[PDB]
Amino acid sequence: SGPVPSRARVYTDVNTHRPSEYWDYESHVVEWGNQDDYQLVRKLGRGKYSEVFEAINITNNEKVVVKILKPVKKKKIKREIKILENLRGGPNIITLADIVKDPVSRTPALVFEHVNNTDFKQLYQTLTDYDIRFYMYEILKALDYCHSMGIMHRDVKPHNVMIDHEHRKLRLIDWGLAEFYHPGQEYNVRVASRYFKGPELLVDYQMYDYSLDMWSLGCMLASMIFRKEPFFHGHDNYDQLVRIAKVLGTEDLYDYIDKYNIELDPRFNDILGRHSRKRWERFVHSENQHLVSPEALDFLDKLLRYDHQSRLTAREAMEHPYFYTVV
Ligand SMILES: Clc1cc(C[NH2+]CCc2ccc[nH]2)ccc1-c1ccccc1
């Protein structure tokens, strides 16, 4: 009878009630400006789909961020642009300022507002319990906003979250893997980075939704409060589910695949084993106890669930007792 259908508990029909203009990215008209207004300063990093540079807009002496895209697929560039234009101005969303092409290379490039990234290794050691709560709340504002706009990020991870700690400024970036949520649509499961992949992706359950971002967020929270990076350390996509099963246990995993009538790939047969459900308190040690609290553990337990429908939505997460000290 195949797998059981599923749809988001929130913002289910946001794209359904909007004109095609909004979500039909293949029909979006992209106006490529002139790259001569921008001077590249330094490389900020390298990715699978792009090279990111700190730059200066010479027409106003203002620092910008320039993302040079490896022009692999036109549909994908149009999708990211449309999503960035749709979300432009949303809370803690990277602001697309310009779309340019270098006159000679004609390589697509996206120009963004400047974010001054604090050294992560230096940041990690000095972050307090309050700082974790504060920045988690900031990502949640970004996620509630994009989910409200019918968009799922699908690549929530530390590398996609820019923090300027001096100014307590946070931006969610890299919307290249982002997609419009349409109820009942079957999506490609080959999204997100291995350590942050939700169980729905690993079991090849294609009818996923905004809740995928909430699992990824839970992985980030678990690594931060427990000082264990990454939290679920898989060596491959099949092993990744085994690492999750070593914490959440195999009984709840079989409950999830039975609820949605999922067929577990035969590659899981000899590696999954049998695992008891572990208490979150077991991950507490002398080096992380100052970041752990019963509220933090209760909130984590509500994000890291196999059942994507049982995870807190970004709005429900923002209302959790863990965030009382921030607002
Ligand atoms: Cl998400 C994050 C992320 C970082 C910082 N990365 C920045 C990645 C980057 C640099 C250049 C391109 N990308 C530091 C800390 C956190 C954090 C803080 C509080 C709670 C959870 C996570």
Asked if 292 and 194 touch (Cβ cutoff 8 Å), the reply is: no
Euclidean distance between CA atoms 264 and 268, whole angstroms: 7
- Contact between 279 and 269 under an 8 Å Cβ cutoff? The reply is no
Q: Show the ligand 1 pocket: residues with CB < 6 angstroms.
A: 44-45, 117, 120, 123, 132, 135-136, 158-159, 161-163, 220, 224
Q: Which two tokens stand for residue 218?
A: 């839970």
Q: What is the rounded CA–CA span in Å between residue 137 and residue 315?
A: 10
Can you tell me the distance from the alpha carbon of 87 to that of 315, in angstroms, rounded to the nearest whole number? Answer: 18
| Cross-strand bridge partners of residue 38 | 57
Encoding tokens for residue 140? 């949640």
- Strands, DSSP E only, in 168-216? 169-172, 179-180
**CATH for the stretch 24-114:** 3.30.200.20
CA atoms within 13 A on the CB side of 45: 10
Closest CA to 211 of 241, 176, 183, 249: 183
Question: Residue 51 annotated as binding?
Answer: yes
The 10 Å Cβ neighbour count of residue 325 is: 12
Reduced to 3 states (helix: H, G, I; strand: E, B; else coil), residue 203 is coil
Task: Tell me which amino acid residue 138 is.
Answer: E
Contacts of residue 289, defined as CB under 8 A and 6 or more positions apart, other chains included, come to none
Q: Where are the domains of the chain?
A: 6-23+115-327, 24-114
Exposed/middle/buried for residue 324 (C-beta within 10 Å: 0-12, 13-18, 19+): exposed
- Report residue 218: phi and psi, to 5°: -60, -40
Report CA dihedral (214, 215, 218, 219) to the nearest 10 degrees: -140
Question: Yes or no: is domain 6-23+115-327 CATH 1.10.510.10?
Answer: yes
**Residue 98 known to be catalytic:** no
**22 close to 14: Cβ distance less than 8 angstroms:** no
Contacts for 251-258 with beta carbons within 8 Å, 24 or more apart? 251/277, 252/277, 252/306, 253/199, 253/306, 255/306, 255/307, 256/199, 256/203, 256/306, 256/307, 257/203
Q: Judge whether 280 and 301 are in contact, CB under 8 Å.
A: yes
Q: Name the residue at shortest CA distance from atom 12 of ligand 1.
A: 159
**Two tokens at 190?**
């080959």
48 marked as part of a ligand binding site: yes
Which candidate in 37, 129, 144, 155 is catalytic?
Answer: 155
26: left (phi over 0), alpha (psi -120 to 50) or beta: alpha
Cα–Cα distance measured from residue 18 to residue 248, given in angstroms and rounded to the nearest whole number: 39
Report resolution in angstroms: 1.9
